[PDB]
Amino acid sequence: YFLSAASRPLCSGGHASNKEKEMVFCKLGVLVRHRISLFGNDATLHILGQTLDARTVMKTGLESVKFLDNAAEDLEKTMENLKQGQFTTTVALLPMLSSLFEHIGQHQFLEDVQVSCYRILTSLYALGQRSALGECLAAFAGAAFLETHLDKHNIYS
């Protein structure tokens, strides 16, 4: 109905809180929260800034391992932002810089965060910043390892 979106800012507070509980089966709450993010996306107005700040507190509050339960479903979570980005600016576009910061913060680990950054580069290139996308290129080159470096030119503009 309509009450799921009215509690989605109450779920945006929950998606940031239950992923900050993934800092220490351990991080499965963030794997449930990434499953909760696709749960509202695969079925379908400041929730664009409310969900992006929920992931901005998820990238900071769970930045101890970037155990490993949130990064695995990132190909499903970034496609959930692909199905919900086109489904609907210093508070919303500023958290988009924190979206690539999680991809530039999980490139110092698997390579599934690079495939999620290109999956976030699909919704970023069709949405119509150089510091985070520029650091993701040269620090993820030779240590498809250049998938996130391909997401730099596909999300800078």
PDB file of C-alpha atoms in Angstrom:
ATOM      1  CA  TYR A   1       0.000   0.000   0.000  1.00  0.00           C
ATOM      2  CA  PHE A   2       1.352   3.407   1.056  1.00  0.00           C
ATOM      3  CA  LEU A   3       2.368   2.996   4.717  1.00  0.00           C
ATOM      4  CA  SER A   4       5.595   1.173   3.810  1.00  0.00           C
ATOM      5  CA  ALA A   5       7.088   4.406   2.466  1.00  0.00           C
ATOM      6  CA  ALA A   6       5.925   6.357   5.534  1.00  0.00           C
ATOM      7  CA  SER A   7       7.892   3.910   7.693  1.00  0.00           C
ATOM      8  CA  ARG A   8      10.752   3.813   5.175  1.00  0.00           C
ATOM      9  CA  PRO A   9      12.367   6.847   6.878  1.00  0.00           C
ATOM     10  CA  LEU A  10      11.824   4.829  10.042  1.00  0.00           C
ATOM     11  CA  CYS A  11      13.393   1.985   8.063  1.00  0.00           C
ATOM     12  CA  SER A  12      16.159   4.337   6.886  1.00  0.00           C
ATOM     13  CA  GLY A  13      17.012   4.875  10.536  1.00  0.00           C
ATOM     14  CA  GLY A  14      16.827   1.112  10.942  1.00  0.00           C
ATOM     15  CA  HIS A  15      18.956   0.355   7.877  1.00  0.00           C
ATOM     16  CA  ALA A  16      21.690   2.600   9.280  1.00  0.00           C
ATOM     17  CA  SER A  17      21.344   1.142  12.789  1.00  0.00           C
ATOM     18  CA  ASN A  18      21.180  -2.559  11.855  1.00  0.00           C
ATOM     19  CA  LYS A  19      24.240  -2.086   9.615  1.00  0.00           C
ATOM     20  CA  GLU A  20      26.139  -0.260  12.369  1.00  0.00           C
ATOM     21  CA  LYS A  21      25.450  -3.456  14.355  1.00  0.00           C
ATOM     22  CA  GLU A  22      27.550  -5.241  11.703  1.00  0.00           C
ATOM     23  CA  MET A  23      30.746  -3.619  13.032  1.00  0.00           C
ATOM     24  CA  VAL A  24      31.535  -6.679  15.159  1.00  0.00           C
ATOM     25  CA  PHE A  25      26.195 -14.388  11.325  1.00  0.00           C
ATOM     26  CA  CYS A  26      27.980 -11.313  12.672  1.00  0.00           C
ATOM     27  CA  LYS A  27      27.366  -8.927   9.759  1.00  0.00           C
ATOM     28  CA  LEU A  28      24.253 -10.827   8.627  1.00  0.00           C
ATOM     29  CA  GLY A  29      22.112  -7.941   9.874  1.00  0.00           C
ATOM     30  CA  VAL A  30      23.669  -5.845   7.123  1.00  0.00           C
ATOM     31  CA  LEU A  31      23.094  -8.830   4.840  1.00  0.00           C
ATOM     32  CA  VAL A  32      19.485  -8.663   6.016  1.00  0.00           C
ATOM     33  CA  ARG A  33      19.504  -4.877   5.523  1.00  0.00           C
ATOM     34  CA  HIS A  34      20.899  -5.236   1.999  1.00  0.00           C
ATOM     35  CA  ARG A  35      18.125  -7.793   1.549  1.00  0.00           C
ATOM     36  CA  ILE A  36      15.750  -5.202   3.023  1.00  0.00           C
ATOM     37  CA  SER A  37      17.013  -2.650   0.485  1.00  0.00           C
ATOM     38  CA  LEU A  38      16.160  -4.964  -2.404  1.00  0.00           C
ATOM     39  CA  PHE A  39      12.874  -5.813  -0.654  1.00  0.00           C
ATOM     40  CA  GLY A  40      11.571  -2.308  -1.321  1.00  0.00           C
ATOM     41  CA  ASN A  41      13.249  -2.151  -4.737  1.00  0.00           C
ATOM     42  CA  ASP A  42      12.199  -5.427  -6.391  1.00  0.00           C
ATOM     43  CA  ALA A  43       8.540  -4.582  -5.677  1.00  0.00           C
ATOM     44  CA  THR A  44       8.760  -1.163  -7.364  1.00  0.00           C
ATOM     45  CA  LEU A  45       9.558  11.990  -1.028  1.00  0.00           C
ATOM     46  CA  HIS A  46      12.947  12.506   0.632  1.00  0.00           C
ATOM     47  CA  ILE A  47      13.688   8.770   0.826  1.00  0.00           C
ATOM     48  CA  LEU A  48      16.395   9.262  -1.823  1.00  0.00           C
ATOM     49  CA  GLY A  49      18.402  11.199   0.747  1.00  0.00           C
ATOM     50  CA  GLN A  50      17.115   9.023   3.591  1.00  0.00           C
ATOM     51  CA  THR A  51      18.285   5.741   2.052  1.00  0.00           C
ATOM     52  CA  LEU A  52      21.588   7.177   0.806  1.00  0.00           C
ATOM     53  CA  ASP A  53      22.390   8.557   4.263  1.00  0.00           C
ATOM     54  CA  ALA A  54      21.429   5.155   5.671  1.00  0.00           C
ATOM     55  CA  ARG A  55      24.125   3.636   3.455  1.00  0.00           C
ATOM     56  CA  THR A  56      26.422   6.540   4.366  1.00  0.00           C
ATOM     57  CA  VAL A  57      26.103   5.521   8.016  1.00  0.00           C
ATOM     58  CA  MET A  58      26.384   1.900   6.869  1.00  0.00           C
ATOM     59  CA  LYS A  59      29.693   2.576   5.116  1.00  0.00           C
ATOM     60  CA  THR A  60      31.041   4.375   8.198  1.00  0.00           C
ATOM     61  CA  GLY A  61      29.481   2.347  11.020  1.00  0.00           C
ATOM     62  CA  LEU A  62      30.621  -0.956   9.462  1.00  0.00           C
ATOM     63  CA  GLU A  63      34.068   0.204   8.296  1.00  0.00           C
ATOM     64  CA  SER A  64      36.043  -2.262  10.436  1.00  0.00           C
ATOM     65  CA  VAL A  65      36.513  -4.921   7.733  1.00  0.00           C
ATOM     66  CA  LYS A  66      36.861  -2.696   4.665  1.00  0.00           C
ATOM     67  CA  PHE A  67      32.907 -10.201   9.210  1.00  0.00           C
ATOM     68  CA  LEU A  68      32.232 -10.461   5.472  1.00  0.00           C
ATOM     69  CA  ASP A  69      28.447 -10.793   5.129  1.00  0.00           C
ATOM     70  CA  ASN A  70      27.587  -7.366   3.691  1.00  0.00           C
ATOM     71  CA  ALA A  71      30.011  -7.281   0.748  1.00  0.00           C
ATOM     72  CA  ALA A  72      28.774 -10.564  -0.746  1.00  0.00           C
ATOM     73  CA  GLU A  73      25.263  -9.355  -1.652  1.00  0.00           C
ATOM     74  CA  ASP A  74      26.572  -6.006  -2.950  1.00  0.00           C
ATOM     75  CA  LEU A  75      25.799  -7.066  -6.526  1.00  0.00           C
ATOM     76  CA  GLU A  76      22.177  -7.459  -5.413  1.00  0.00           C
ATOM     77  CA  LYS A  77      22.248  -4.272  -3.330  1.00  0.00           C
ATOM     78  CA  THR A  78      23.719  -2.047  -6.056  1.00  0.00           C
ATOM     79  CA  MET A  79      21.151  -3.353  -8.536  1.00  0.00           C
ATOM     80  CA  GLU A  80      18.535  -2.548  -5.888  1.00  0.00           C
ATOM     81  CA  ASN A  81      19.702   1.068  -6.046  1.00  0.00           C
ATOM     82  CA  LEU A  82      19.541   0.687  -9.837  1.00  0.00           C
ATOM     83  CA  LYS A  83      15.883  -0.375  -9.683  1.00  0.00           C
ATOM     84  CA  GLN A  84      15.094   2.261  -7.025  1.00  0.00           C
ATOM     85  CA  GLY A  85      17.262   5.112  -8.326  1.00  0.00           C
ATOM     86  CA  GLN A  86      15.158   5.481 -11.477  1.00  0.00           C
ATOM     87  CA  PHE A  87      11.944   4.624  -9.593  1.00  0.00           C
ATOM     88  CA  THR A  88      11.379   7.975  -7.853  1.00  0.00           C
ATOM     89  CA  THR A  89      21.447  19.157  -3.388  1.00  0.00           C
ATOM     90  CA  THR A  90      23.982  19.148  -0.547  1.00  0.00           C
ATOM     91  CA  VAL A  91      22.241  16.383   1.437  1.00  0.00           C
ATOM     92  CA  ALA A  92      21.487  13.890  -1.378  1.00  0.00           C
ATOM     93  CA  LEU A  93      24.336  14.364  -3.863  1.00  0.00           C
ATOM     94  CA  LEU A  94      26.738  14.557  -0.924  1.00  0.00           C
ATOM     95  CA  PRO A  95      25.745  10.991   0.122  1.00  0.00           C
ATOM     96  CA  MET A  96      26.332   9.843  -3.467  1.00  0.00           C
ATOM     97  CA  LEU A  97      29.982  10.713  -2.818  1.00  0.00           C
ATOM     98  CA  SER A  98      29.692   8.376   0.182  1.00  0.00           C
ATOM     99  CA  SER A  99      28.272   5.702  -2.138  1.00  0.00           C
ATOM    100  CA  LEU A 100      31.465   5.554  -4.206  1.00  0.00           C
ATOM    101  CA  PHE A 101      33.432   5.930  -0.965  1.00  0.00           C
ATOM    102  CA  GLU A 102      32.120   2.525   0.120  1.00  0.00           C
ATOM    103  CA  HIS A 103      33.336   1.152  -3.216  1.00  0.00           C
ATOM    104  CA  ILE A 104      36.639   3.011  -2.784  1.00  0.00           C
ATOM    105  CA  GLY A 105      36.664   1.774   0.830  1.00  0.00           C
ATOM    106  CA  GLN A 106      36.005  -1.878  -0.011  1.00  0.00           C
ATOM    107  CA  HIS A 107      38.596  -2.016  -2.816  1.00  0.00           C
ATOM    108  CA  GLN A 108      41.244  -2.447  -0.084  1.00  0.00           C
ATOM    109  CA  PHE A 109      40.121  -5.902   1.075  1.00  0.00           C
ATOM    110  CA  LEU A 110      36.907  -9.226  -2.872  1.00  0.00           C
ATOM    111  CA  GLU A 111      36.291  -7.812  -6.349  1.00  0.00           C
ATOM    112  CA  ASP A 112      32.488  -7.925  -5.972  1.00  0.00           C
ATOM    113  CA  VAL A 113      32.566  -4.351  -4.648  1.00  0.00           C
ATOM    114  CA  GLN A 114      34.109  -3.398  -8.005  1.00  0.00           C
ATOM    115  CA  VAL A 115      31.234  -5.110  -9.832  1.00  0.00           C
ATOM    116  CA  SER A 116      28.810  -3.272  -7.550  1.00  0.00           C
ATOM    117  CA  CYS A 117      30.512   0.056  -8.331  1.00  0.00           C
ATOM    118  CA  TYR A 118      29.989  -0.600 -12.041  1.00  0.00           C
ATOM    119  CA  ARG A 119      26.442  -1.630 -11.111  1.00  0.00           C
ATOM    120  CA  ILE A 120      26.211   1.738  -9.367  1.00  0.00           C
ATOM    121  CA  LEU A 121      27.827   3.228 -12.480  1.00  0.00           C
ATOM    122  CA  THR A 122      24.800   2.019 -14.446  1.00  0.00           C
ATOM    123  CA  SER A 123      22.420   4.141 -12.363  1.00  0.00           C
ATOM    124  CA  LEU A 124      24.893   7.035 -12.133  1.00  0.00           C
ATOM    125  CA  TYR A 125      25.486   7.345 -15.885  1.00  0.00           C
ATOM    126  CA  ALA A 126      21.738   7.298 -16.558  1.00  0.00           C
ATOM    127  CA  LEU A 127      20.958   9.649 -13.649  1.00  0.00           C
ATOM    128  CA  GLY A 128      21.505  12.735 -15.821  1.00  0.00           C
ATOM    129  CA  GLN A 129      32.872  13.749  -6.951  1.00  0.00           C
ATOM    130  CA  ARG A 130      36.119  13.549  -8.906  1.00  0.00           C
ATOM    131  CA  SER A 131      38.096  13.042  -5.691  1.00  0.00           C
ATOM    132  CA  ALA A 132      36.471   9.755  -4.654  1.00  0.00           C
ATOM    133  CA  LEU A 133      36.193   8.431  -8.218  1.00  0.00           C
ATOM    134  CA  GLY A 134      39.789   9.468  -8.884  1.00  0.00           C
ATOM    135  CA  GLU A 135      41.099   7.646  -5.818  1.00  0.00           C
ATOM    136  CA  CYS A 136      39.177   4.511  -6.828  1.00  0.00           C
ATOM    137  CA  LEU A 137      41.048   4.346 -10.153  1.00  0.00           C
ATOM    138  CA  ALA A 138      44.768   4.435  -9.305  1.00  0.00           C
ATOM    139  CA  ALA A 139      44.432   2.551  -5.989  1.00  0.00           C
ATOM    140  CA  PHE A 140      42.577  -0.390  -7.601  1.00  0.00           C
ATOM    141  CA  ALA A 141      44.687  -0.893 -10.734  1.00  0.00           C
ATOM    142  CA  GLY A 142      47.162  -3.742 -10.305  1.00  0.00           C
ATOM    143  CA  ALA A 143      47.141  -4.934  -6.690  1.00  0.00           C
ATOM    144  CA  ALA A 144      38.749  -7.839 -13.938  1.00  0.00           C
ATOM    145  CA  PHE A 145      40.505  -5.773 -11.273  1.00  0.00           C
ATOM    146  CA  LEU A 146      39.892  -2.567 -13.265  1.00  0.00           C
ATOM    147  CA  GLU A 147      36.092  -2.851 -13.080  1.00  0.00           C
ATOM    148  CA  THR A 148      35.858  -0.113 -10.432  1.00  0.00           C
ATOM    149  CA  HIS A 149      38.365   1.977 -12.387  1.00  0.00           C
ATOM    150  CA  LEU A 150      35.965   1.581 -15.306  1.00  0.00           C
ATOM    151  CA  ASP A 151      33.290   2.917 -12.941  1.00  0.00           C
ATOM    152  CA  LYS A 152      35.281   6.151 -12.586  1.00  0.00           C
ATOM    153  CA  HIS A 153      34.591   7.451 -16.105  1.00  0.00           C
ATOM    154  CA  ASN A 154      31.091   5.918 -15.982  1.00  0.00           C
ATOM    155  CA  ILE A 155      30.127   7.836 -12.807  1.00  0.00           C
ATOM    156  CA  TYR A 156      32.097  11.095 -13.066  1.00  0.00           C
ATOM    157  CA  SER A 157      29.562  12.451 -15.574  1.00  0.00           C
TER     158      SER A 157
END
